[PDB]
Design a binder for this molecule. Structure first.
Ligand SMILES: [Mg+2]
Ligand SMILES: [Mg+2]
Ligand SMILES: [Mg+2]
Ligand SMILES: [Mg+2]
Ligand SMILES: [Mg+2]
Ligand SMILES: [Mg+2]
Ligand SMILES: [Mg+2]
Ligand SMILES: [Mg+2]
Ligand SMILES: [Mg+2]
Ligand SMILES: [Mg+2]
Ligand SMILES: [Mg+2]
Ligand SMILES: [Mg+2]
Ligand SMILES: [Mg+2]
Ligand SMILES: [Mg+2]
Ligand SMILES: [Mg+2]
Ligand SMILES: [Mg+2]
Ligand SMILES: [Mg+2]
Ligand SMILES: [Mg+2]
Ligand SMILES: [Mg+2]
Lengths: 69, 275, 44
RNA sequence: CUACCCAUGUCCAGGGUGAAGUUCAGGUAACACUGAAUGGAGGCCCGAACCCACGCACGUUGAAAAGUGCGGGGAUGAGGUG
RNA sequence: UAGGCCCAGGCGACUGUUUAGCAAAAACACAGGUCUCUGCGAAGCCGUAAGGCGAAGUAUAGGGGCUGACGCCUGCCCGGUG
């Protein structure tokens, strides 16, 4: 039942600009689902049926490499 | 179904074969053939460049519509014939304006049904239409990559691919090998799964039966001279005397990926196949 | 005992013939050599 | 000449055995099956032409720079041959 | 003119192929099994390049490695090398 919502992607900082483009360019390949836009990214999340916890784990991961993991 | 021969001799000991339950006729349409001579794996220099090929029963090529562009015109299934070049079976269509064509016969269909091929045909086996007008979750076969070129993706007997969602000008599609890939939304596709799925269970039975499908014997590498293969020579039944098994042209042949690194299509492959 | 030489004329002319010799630079070299030596039979 | 491939032709006396299927019956819950008739499958059997080359003997400045004689193998096929 | 037969074991499942001219086999092949690469201008291969085979095929398809009908099975080790 929509383990992830669109507002989650929004608050994750995944909206336009350059920083959010880097955010998606990282997160996508960190999930092996390639690149997308916001809506396309959400639809890919839905179609591959990936779990919320692994999504958050990779989120924290890519923030750490952003912060110098 | 599958017919099993009774073991009257060592020849047919385990042999089995199909039964052609669906073939409705036995004479091809005359005005739809073309000459075709086998080539025995020899390029335009008369040199052998592909081993294990040659001989076999003479065939005659049927011409098949892979574009399926005639639209708005309701065709009609007439027969289901047997094609010695494909692996699947082909059907004959009678368009209501007097024209006859061959179609890869998907499973389920039988003589009498109707066909439409426009971007307005409804979701139904046999019909064809561009990918955009196709709802999500349906199975599909005979996919094409460049618009207006004709299908060249999943095509053999029993294969079937699936649609997975819409995008701007691309579509997410999972192929038969479990690979996922974006595809231009303007291409056409063919509903339903290719019939004749039992084709994978057939047991050949005896050497001659593969001989007369144009297949020649293959000599294992480990029994040649060292002059002819990186496996040659030895005590006499000696193991691989190298760090990895190698192709006859000196290249590793276990797990050594070969897809080109700088391919100009990787931007369309979202999930490489797994196994 | 099927010996090596099985005579035939069409084959001979299509292989060692004159018009085949005058069909490539090397054949013309052969003909020039034969002429220079002075042989009485250029081709076959 | 020999190795493999491509296109187009052609050759294989004669006799056995009897798969599937079909039709009858019995049979069973109909089936499982059993028994007859029909049918004519098979890298099936025996054996000439043809192809091959397992044993022995002879020959070894030979009839012959690889043969002959008596036996041997396949013989509708992964056939032989122009 | 016209099959000697029988009782035991080893090897190879079988019909087949092989050192023209000292080796016909337990060697090769094979039907089956398994591993691996390949999303289509596919991978591989020939060619310096055009041009081709693969294939007028599309993962139930194609190439490569090992094993070699069928029945019962294929144990432990990832330090080293790939
Ligand atoms: Mg091969
Ligand atoms: Mg068999
Ligand atoms: Mg050897
Ligand atoms: Mg070497
Ligand atoms: Mg060695
Ligand atoms: Mg026989
Ligand atoms: Mg021989
Ligand atoms: Mg004799
Ligand atoms: Mg015999
Ligand atoms: Mg044997
Ligand atoms: Mg034998
Ligand atoms: Mg010898
Ligand atoms: Mg012997
Ligand atoms: Mg011998
Ligand atoms: Mg095999
Ligand atoms: Mg071509
Ligand atoms: Mg072996
Ligand atoms: Mg063994
Ligand atoms: Mg083991």
């Amino acid at each position: 039942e929509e383990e992830i919502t669109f507002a989650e992607l929004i608050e994750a900082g995944l909206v336009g600009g350059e920083m959010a483009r880097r955010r998606r360019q990282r997160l996508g390949e960190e999930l092996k689902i390639g690149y997308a836009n916001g809506r396309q990214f959400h639809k890919r999340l839905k179609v591959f049926r990936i779990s919320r916890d692994a999504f958050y784990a990779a989120l924290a991961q890519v923030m750490r490499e952003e912060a110098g993991d | 179904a599958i017919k099993k021969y009774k073991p009257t001799s060592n020849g047919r000991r385990g042999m089995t074969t199909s039964d052609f339950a669906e073939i409705t006729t036995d004479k091809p349409e005359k005005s739809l053939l073309a000459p075709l001579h086998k080539k025995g794996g020899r390029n335009n220099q008369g040199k052998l460049t592909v081993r294990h090929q040659g001989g076999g029963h003479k065939r005659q090529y049927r011409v098949i519509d892979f574009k399926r562009d005639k639209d708005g015109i309701p065709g009609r299934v007439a027969t289901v014939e047997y094609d010695p070049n494909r692996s699947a079976n082909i059907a004959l269509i009678n368009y209501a304006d007097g024209e006859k064509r061959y179609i890869l016969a998907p499973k389920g269909i039988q003589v009498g049904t109707e066909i439409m091929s426009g971007p307005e045909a409804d979701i139904k086996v046999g019909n064809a239409l561009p990918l955009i007008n196709i709802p999500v979750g349906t199975v599909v076969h005979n996919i094409e990559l460049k618009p207006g070129k004709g299908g060249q993706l999943v095509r053999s007997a029993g294969t079937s691919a699936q649609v997975l969602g819409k995008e701007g000008k691309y579509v997410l599609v999972r192929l038969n090998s479990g690979e996922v890939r974006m595809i231009l939304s303007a291409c056409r596709a063919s509903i339903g799964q290719v019939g004749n799925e039992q084709h994978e269970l057939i047991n050949i039975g005896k050497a001659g039966r593969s001989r007369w499908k144009g297949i020649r014997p293959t000599v294992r590498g480990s029994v040649m001279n060292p002059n002819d293969h990186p496996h040659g020579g030895g005590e006499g039944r000696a193991p691989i005397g190298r760090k990895s098994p190698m192709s006859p042209w000196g290249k590793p042949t276990l797990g050594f990926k070969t897809r080109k690194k700088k391919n100009k299509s990787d931007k369309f492959i979202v999930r490489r196949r797994k196994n | 005992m099927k010996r090596t030489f099985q005579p035939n004329n069409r084959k001979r002319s299509k292989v060692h013939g004159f018009r085949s010799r005058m069909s490539s630079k090397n054949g013309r070299l052969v003909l020039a050599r034969r002429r220079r030596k002075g042989r009485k039979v250029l081709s076959a």
